[PDB]
Design an enzyme around this catalytic site. Structure first.
Site, PDB file in Angstrom:
ATOM      1  N   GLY A  18      -1.527 -19.127  48.839  1.00  0.00           N
ATOM      2  CA  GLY A  18      -0.885 -17.892  48.407  1.00  0.00           C
ATOM      3  C   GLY A  18       0.454 -17.595  49.066  1.00  0.00           C
ATOM      4  O   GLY A  18       0.887 -18.307  49.977  1.00  0.00           O
ATOM      5  N   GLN A  19       1.115 -16.542  48.587  1.00  0.00           N
ATOM      6  CA  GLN A  19       2.331 -16.025  49.209  1.00  0.00           C
ATOM      7  C   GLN A  19       2.196 -14.517  49.346  1.00  0.00           C
ATOM      8  O   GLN A  19       1.131 -13.950  49.064  1.00  0.00           O
ATOM      9  CB  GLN A  19       3.572 -16.363  48.380  1.00  0.00           C
ATOM     10  CG  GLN A  19       3.931 -17.839  48.349  1.00  0.00           C
ATOM     11  CD  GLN A  19       5.275 -18.110  48.986  1.00  0.00           C
ATOM     12  OE1 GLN A  19       5.895 -19.147  48.743  1.00  0.00           O
ATOM     13  NE2 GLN A  19       5.735 -17.173  49.810  1.00  0.00           N
ATOM     14  N   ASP A 130      -7.536  -0.789  56.035  1.00  0.00           N
ATOM     15  CA  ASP A 130      -7.294  -1.392  54.721  1.00  0.00           C
ATOM     16  C   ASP A 130      -8.520  -2.131  54.182  1.00  0.00           C
ATOM     17  O   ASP A 130      -8.496  -3.342  53.919  1.00  0.00           O
ATOM     18  CB  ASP A 130      -6.075  -2.311  54.753  1.00  0.00           C
ATOM     19  CG  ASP A 130      -5.589  -2.677  53.358  1.00  0.00           C
ATOM     20  OD1 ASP A 130      -5.976  -1.987  52.374  1.00  0.00           O
ATOM     21  OD2 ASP A 130      -4.813  -3.651  53.247  1.00  0.00           O
TER      22      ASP A 130
HETATM   23  C1  LIG Z   1      -5.425 -16.507  58.555  1.00  0.00           C
HETATM   24  O1  LIG Z   1      -5.025 -15.209  58.243  1.00  0.00           O
HETATM   25  C2  LIG Z   1      -5.618 -14.577  57.178  1.00  0.00           C
HETATM   26  C3  LIG Z   1      -5.984 -15.409  55.992  1.00  0.00           C
HETATM   27  C4  LIG Z   1      -6.645 -14.761  54.807  1.00  0.00           C
HETATM   28  N1  LIG Z   1      -6.993 -15.610  53.679  1.00  0.00           N
HETATM   29  C5  LIG Z   1      -7.999 -16.691  53.799  1.00  0.00           C
HETATM   30  C6  LIG Z   1      -8.793 -17.013  55.063  1.00  0.00           C
HETATM   31  C7  LIG Z   1      -8.769 -16.112  56.261  1.00  0.00           C
HETATM   32  N2  LIG Z   1      -8.750 -15.436  57.174  1.00  0.00           N
HETATM   33  C8  LIG Z   1      -9.798 -18.128  55.047  1.00  0.00           C
HETATM   34  N3  LIG Z   1     -10.049 -18.920  53.888  1.00  0.00           N
HETATM   35  C9  LIG Z   1      -9.343 -18.672  52.660  1.00  0.00           C
HETATM   36  C10 LIG Z   1      -9.627 -19.523  51.436  1.00  0.00           C
HETATM   37  C11 LIG Z   1      -8.882 -19.260  50.164  1.00  0.00           C
HETATM   38  O2  LIG Z   1      -9.175 -20.064  49.054  1.00  0.00           O
HETATM   39  C12 LIG Z   1     -10.076 -21.129  49.211  1.00  0.00           C
HETATM   40  C13 LIG Z   1     -10.840 -21.322  47.903  1.00  0.00           C
HETATM   41  C14 LIG Z   1     -10.134 -20.550  46.796  1.00  0.00           C
HETATM   42  N4  LIG Z   1     -10.839 -20.797  45.489  1.00  0.00           N
HETATM   43  C15 LIG Z   1     -11.349 -19.712  44.636  1.00  0.00           C
HETATM   44  C16 LIG Z   1     -11.600 -20.226  43.201  1.00  0.00           C
HETATM   45  N5  LIG Z   1     -12.420 -21.419  43.210  1.00  0.00           N
HETATM   46  C17 LIG Z   1     -13.074 -21.758  41.949  1.00  0.00           C
HETATM   47  C18 LIG Z   1     -11.866 -22.439  44.057  1.00  0.00           C
HETATM   48  C19 LIG Z   1     -11.746 -21.924  45.460  1.00  0.00           C
HETATM   49  C20 LIG Z   1      -7.868 -18.162  50.091  1.00  0.00           C
HETATM   50  O3  LIG Z   1      -7.161 -17.889  48.946  1.00  0.00           O
HETATM   51  C21 LIG Z   1      -5.995 -17.146  49.087  1.00  0.00           C
HETATM   52  C22 LIG Z   1      -7.570 -17.309  51.285  1.00  0.00           C
HETATM   53  C23 LIG Z   1      -8.305 -17.563  52.573  1.00  0.00           C
HETATM   54  C24 LIG Z   1      -6.922 -13.275  54.826  1.00  0.00           C
HETATM   55 CL1  LIG Z   1      -7.670 -12.424  53.508  1.00  0.00          CL
HETATM   56  C25 LIG Z   1      -6.547 -12.461  56.015  1.00  0.00           C
HETATM   57  C26 LIG Z   1      -5.900 -13.098  57.190  1.00  0.00           C
HETATM   58 CL2  LIG Z   1      -5.495 -12.090  58.537  1.00  0.00          CL
END
Ligand SMILES: COc1cc(Nc2c(C#N)cnc3cc(OCCCN4CCN(C)CC4)c(OC)cc23)c(Cl)cc1Cl
Length: 266
Positions: A18-19, A130
């Site tokens: 993501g961005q 949040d």
């Molecule tokens: C490190 O900092 C931060 C990182 C995050 N974000 C993420 C963290 C964490 N933590 C861990 N793991 C993540 C995995 C993700 O996608 C993996 C699979 C996606 N698919 C869905 C659809 N199907 C069918 C295939 C799989 C993802 O997607 C954007 C974001 C993640 C947040 Cl919310 C807050 C803080 Cl502070």
């Protein structure tokens, strides 16, 4: 520098996830063995310990229902290294392909886990600021964890999830997180539907202050909408604790809705 810091050379920034108006999120590999996720700063984007004070909250918090910090970087280029959640955002999960098979028992138990994470937060005397499905990560086996304490604080702004007193007067409390938890409960029972359908922010703020509340989502039990209403009480101190909410949801199908039968959606 502290013991949460690592060599950036440790980090395989691999797939992109993501961005934002902050930076990015990447799958990656840590010390060649370990799957992690990285919230990035794409060079300049924003302030040092603004991006790096979500670390200072996440360092002192440490629960199984909270997304886990692994390490940090300030050897710029800059990173926040965390536990990798396989099924991404709860919001995407609810809107996605599996969303529609989700039934109450599943949804209540996800609610439970989140309550659980927040109840820990509650006794640590922190506030999330949040809380909403978008900041809940899902892993395998329908596991959900709280993430993105990105505004969080000791108890020393998308308003639809935001408690009035917090949106209006900046009074953030664990009690305002509760308000948001109740809104989060409408997300789970509608499978990701944006709250206050058809309304714009200012209209939400005006109606909620006159005491408008979202009605019982379709096929959602009255007992569960009662709980949302308790979460939406005008007086912050009358809203329930995350401890009550956690125990209420775990026990739900025996103590509260012991005669539940699935419908076409829930
Ligand atoms: C490190 O900092 C931060 C990182 C995050 N974000 C993420 C963290 C964490 N933590 C861990 N793991 C993540 C995995 C993700 O996608 C993996 C699979 C996606 N698919 C869905 C659809 N199907 C069918 C295939 C799989 C993802 O997607 C954007 C974001 C993640 C947040 Cl919310 C807050 C803080 Cl502070």
């Amino acid at each position: 520098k502290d013991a949460w810091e690592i060599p950036r050379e440790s980090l395989r920034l691999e797939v992109k996830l993501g961005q934002g108006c902050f930076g990015e999120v990447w799958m990656g590999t840590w010390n060649g063995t370990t799957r992690v996720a990285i919230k990035t700063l794409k060079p300049g984007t924003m302030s040092p310990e603004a991006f790096l004070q979500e670390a200072q909250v996440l360092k002192k918090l440490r629960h199984e229902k909270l997304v886990q910090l692994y390490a940090v970087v300030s050897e710029e280029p800059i990173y926040i290294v965390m536990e990798y959640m396989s099924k991404g955002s709860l919001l995407d999960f609810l809107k996605g392909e599996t969303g529609k098979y989700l039934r109450l028992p599943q949804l209540v138990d996800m609610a439970a886990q989140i309550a659980s994470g927040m109840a820990y937060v509650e006794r640590m005397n922190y506030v999330h600021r949040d809380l909403r499905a978008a900041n809940i990560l899902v892993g395998e086996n329908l596991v959900c964890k709280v993430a993105d304490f990105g505004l969080a604080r000791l108890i020393e702004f998308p308003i639809k999830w935001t408690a009035p007193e917090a949106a209006l007067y900046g009074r953030f409390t664990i009690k305002s997180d509760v308000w948001s938890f109740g809104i989060l409960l409408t997300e789970l029972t509608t499978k990701g539907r944006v709250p206050y359908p058809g309304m714009v922010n200012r209209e939400v703020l005006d109606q909620v202050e006159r005491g408008y509340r979202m009605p019982c989502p379709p096929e959602c039990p009255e007992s569960l909408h009662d709980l949302m209403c308790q979460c939406w009480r005008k007086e912050p101190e009358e809203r329930p604790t995350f401890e009550y909410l956690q125990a209420f949801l775990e026990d739900y199908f025996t103590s509260t809705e012991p005669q539940y039968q699935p419908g076409e959606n829930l």
